[PDB]
Each structure stands twice: as C-alpha cells, then as structure tokens.
Amino acid sequence: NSEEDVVKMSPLPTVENQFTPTTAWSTSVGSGIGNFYSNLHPALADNVVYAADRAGLVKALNADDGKEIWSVSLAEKDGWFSKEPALLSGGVTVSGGHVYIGSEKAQVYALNTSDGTVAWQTKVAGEALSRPVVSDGLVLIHTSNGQLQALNEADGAVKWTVNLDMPSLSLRGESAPTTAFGAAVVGGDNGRVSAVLMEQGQMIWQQRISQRLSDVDTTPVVVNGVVFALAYNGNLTALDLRSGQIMWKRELGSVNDFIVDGNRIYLVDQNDRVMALTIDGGVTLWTQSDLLHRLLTSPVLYNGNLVVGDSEGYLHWINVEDGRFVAQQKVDSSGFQTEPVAADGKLLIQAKDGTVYSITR
C-alpha cells in the first residue's frame, strides 16, 4: 500500500528577506472551512473584519486589535442536542450595512453589520457557491446549477434569473460576476463568458473562450471597456465589452483569480506559475515557476508586491518588476486556500482552521 503523485510538489524555495514581516493579530474562527473546497474568506468595511466558518459561525473582529464586536451562529438547532450545519460557502461580502453569505443548502443570508441579526434570508435555485456580488441595489448570486439570480438588497426576493448551460463534469466553485455600465459579465462552467442586462436579464452576448476536457472562468475583470477572461485549461482572452469580439488571446488556463494594474496583468497559471502579461498583446514580462504544483492561492497586490499563500501555509512576497522572491513567512500549519484580502493598507488571510491572520511589515 503506497501512494504517489504524477507531478512532484516543488521544494520550498530559499530566499533572503529584505524586510521582516510580522503578524499583528491572529483570531480563531470555529474549525475554518475544514478540508473542503470553499470560497469563504474575510472582508473589510469601515475598520472591522467579518469572518465565517463552514460550520455556520460568523464573527466580527476589530481590524486593529482583534477584539470581538459580535458573534452569531447560523446553524439552526432543534433543541439542546441536535445541531445541523449551515454549510456556509459563499464568500463574505459587505455593502450598505449588510453581510451577505452564501450556503450549500441554496440559502443566502444577509446579516446586519450592527448586531448580527438576520435582516433577511432567501432560498435560491441551487448551492450558492459564488461570492454574493453587490451592485445597483441588487445582490448577484451564481448558484451551482448555472443559474445566475439577482436578489433584492432590501426585501430578499429573487428579482430575475438567467440560465447558463452546465456540462456533465465541471470544477467545484462558481464565477462571481463583475458589473460594469449596467451590465453583469459572468463566466459559466461551460467556457462561455456571457453579459446580461441587470434590468431584466436579457443576454446581451455570449462568447466561447475555451479550448473529457472541462473549463471554468472565475470572475472575468473589466477595465476601460475591455473584459479580461481566463478560462481553466483554456486561454486568457480580451473581449470587447460591447461586441464580444476577441481582441487577443493566449494559451494559458487557471481557476484562481488574477489582477490588472497599470499596463500589466499578474496571474497564477494552473500549474502555479506566477506570470505577468501585457494588456496590449499579452507578451510576457517575467515568470516565477519556482512554486510549481504548490497549490497557490489567488495573488493579492499588497504594497506593490504579490502575496500568495500555498498548501503548507507559507506566505510568499514576490516582486513585480522582474519576478524575484522578496520574502517568505511561515504563518499557519494547516495551509492557505482562500484568497487574501488587501484594503486600507491591511492584508488579511484566513487559513483552513479559520484563524484569521493580519499581516504587515
């Protein structure tokens, strides 16, 4: 009885820290997302950090000291003994004094930022696995059936639904639509980037950007009227926001998100190759293939450097200009899987144990 992997996990790189990172505080949330594949991560709004765990617990923490403001358990209990898990899997979002959290039971909760009381709770078509995007007074959810639904912020009733085709075999997780100029662009698990009007849900256009071969898009981004969409095992593409004509393409696929800054596109290939392409034509600037098959996380641009987690929990700071490691740190032993969040000069990351860590320098 023995087990082996087709691709050997890359060795931990050795680097000299130009700056010594630290850990301002580390609060613990119940059992984290465990070993499952979830999009659950913290969020920041007005100097407070909201976190959650797969069990159902939700916590609010001070972004400076880690002090607890309120806590609420969303697992309904039928007495003093029975306790059914809530299975939270939608990334925590905050907007206009609310905390929108998905679930694996096709439920969307909207807790109050004041005292944690449920403002509303809605039933959706399927497992609301995607981040509950918020825009134009609507909450966009991308269920696991391919159905993009738009709940109302105030009431909580499904305003409109749009059906996106689903394949036989797909990758766990869903794409969170990005809204621009009164239109939501979303990428289904069928390799199609589709734009939908918010008023009713009329499909403006739909383009295939793919290449038993599966694919997934995971949140195409928008800049200056061009939509950058990266399909798993497919090819990164730039589409016109209005017509959908492919402007340029490149053969590289991934599921974890990427980022665009100035005239550069930093992304993490599926084989864990942190690359930096150019918007104009996608001509590569540098590549950092030293973390091959380490199961990295979505990069975050903190203080002009890409921060990325990994399976062992090590947090790597890599530069942008050339692609040289700038530092590494050992934060947690369980490992990092959910994207880091950088905002207000604060970098936060949740491990698989639910221990929210705040990093600095």
Partner 1 sequence: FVVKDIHFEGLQRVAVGAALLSMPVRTGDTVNDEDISNTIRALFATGNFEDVRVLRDGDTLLVQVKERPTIASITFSGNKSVKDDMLKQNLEASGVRVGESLDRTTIADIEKGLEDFYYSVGKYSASVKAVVTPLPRNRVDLKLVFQEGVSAEIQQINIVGNHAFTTDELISHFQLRDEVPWWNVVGDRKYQKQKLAGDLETLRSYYLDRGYARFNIDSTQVSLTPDKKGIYVTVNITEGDQYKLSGVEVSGNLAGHSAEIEQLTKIEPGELYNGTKVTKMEDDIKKLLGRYGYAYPRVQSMPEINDADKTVKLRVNVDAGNRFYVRKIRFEGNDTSKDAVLRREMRQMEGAWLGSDLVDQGKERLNRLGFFETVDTDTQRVPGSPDQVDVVYKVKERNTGSFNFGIGYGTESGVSFQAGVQQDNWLGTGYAVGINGTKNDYQTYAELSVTNPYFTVDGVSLGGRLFYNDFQADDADLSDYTNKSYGTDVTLGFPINEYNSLRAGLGYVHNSLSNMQPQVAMWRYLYSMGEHPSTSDQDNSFKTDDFTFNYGWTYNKLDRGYFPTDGSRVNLTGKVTIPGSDNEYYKVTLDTATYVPIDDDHKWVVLGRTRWGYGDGLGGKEMPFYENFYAGGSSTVRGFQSNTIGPKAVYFPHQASNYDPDYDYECATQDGAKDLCKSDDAVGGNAMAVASLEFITPTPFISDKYANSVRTSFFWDMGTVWDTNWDSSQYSGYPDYSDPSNIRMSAGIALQWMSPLGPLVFSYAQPFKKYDGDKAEQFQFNIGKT
Query: Element (H or E) spanning 330, and its range?
Result: strand 325-330
Residue range at the interface with partner 1 (CB under 8 A); choices 18-26, 29-37, 66-74, 327-335: 29-37
Q: At a CB cut-off of 8 Å and minimum separation 6, what does 169 contact? A: 212, 214
Residue choice 223, 285, 295, 301 for contact with partner 1 (CB under 8 A): 295
Question: Is residue 37 a contact residue for partner 1 (CB under 8 A)?
Answer: yes
Decide: is 172 part of the binding site for partner 1 (CB under 8 A).
Answer: yes
User: Is residue 341 a contact point for partner 1 (CB under 8 A)?
Assistant: no
Q: Are 268 and 256 in contact (CB under 8 A)?
A: yes
Judged by CB under 8 A, the stretch of 99-107, 156-164, 221-229, 338-346 that binds partner 1 is 99-107
CB 76 within 8 A of CB 85: no
Contacting partner 1 (CB under 8 A), which of 17, 31, 35, 71? Answer: 35
Does 283 bind partner 1 (CB under 8 A)? Our answer is no
Provide the token pair at 97.
């004094």
Q: State which of residues 12, 24, 69, 166 lies at the interface with partner 1 (CB under 8 A).
A: 166
Determine the size of the site formed for partner 1 (CB under 8 A). 32
Q: Is 232 in the site for partner 1 (CB under 8 A)?
A: yes
Distance CA 258, CA 77 (A): 40
270 binds partner 1 (CB under 8 A): yes
Token pair belonging to 124: 């959706």
Provide the minimum distance between the beta carbon of 133 and partner 1 in the complex, in angstroms, as a whole number.
Answer: 21
Tell me if 251 contacts partner 1 by CB under 8 A: no
Measured torsion, CA atoms of residues 131, 132, 135, 138, in degrees rounded to the nearest 10: 160
Of 3 and 46, CB closest to partner 1: 3
Site for partner 1 in 176-215 (CB under 8 A): 212, 214
Q: How far is the CB of 173 from partner 1 (least distance, A)?
A: 8
Contacts of 352 (CB under 8 A, 6+ apart): 32, 33, 34, 35, 332, 334, 335, 336, 337
Is 171 a binding residue for partner 1 by CB under 8 A? The answer is: yes
Strand pairing of 300-302 and 305-308? antiparallel
163 binds partner 1 (CB under 8 A): no
Nearest to 94 by CA among 145, 52, 55: 52
DSSP 3-state assignment of 289? helix
Task: Phi first, then psi: give them for residue 290, nearest 5 degrees.
Answer: -80, -10
Strand-pair category, 314-318 with 325-330: antiparallel
Report the residue number, 41 or 59, with the smaller CB distance to partner 1.
41
Tell me which stretch binds partner 1 (CB under 8 A): 20-28, 112-120, 124-132, 195-203.
124-132
Which residues in the 39-78 window bind partner 1 by CB under 8 A? none
Find the binder of partner 1 among 116, 126, 309, 340 (CB under 8 A). Answer: 126
CA distances from 157 to 56, 86, 130, 269 (A): 22, 20, 18, 38
Query: Nearest-CA neighbor of 153 among 198, 220, 195?
Result: 198
Which residues of the chain form contacts with partner 1 (CB under 8 A)? 3-7, 35-37, 84, 87, 104-106, 125-127, 144-145, 166, 168-173, 212, 214, 232, 255-256, 270, 295
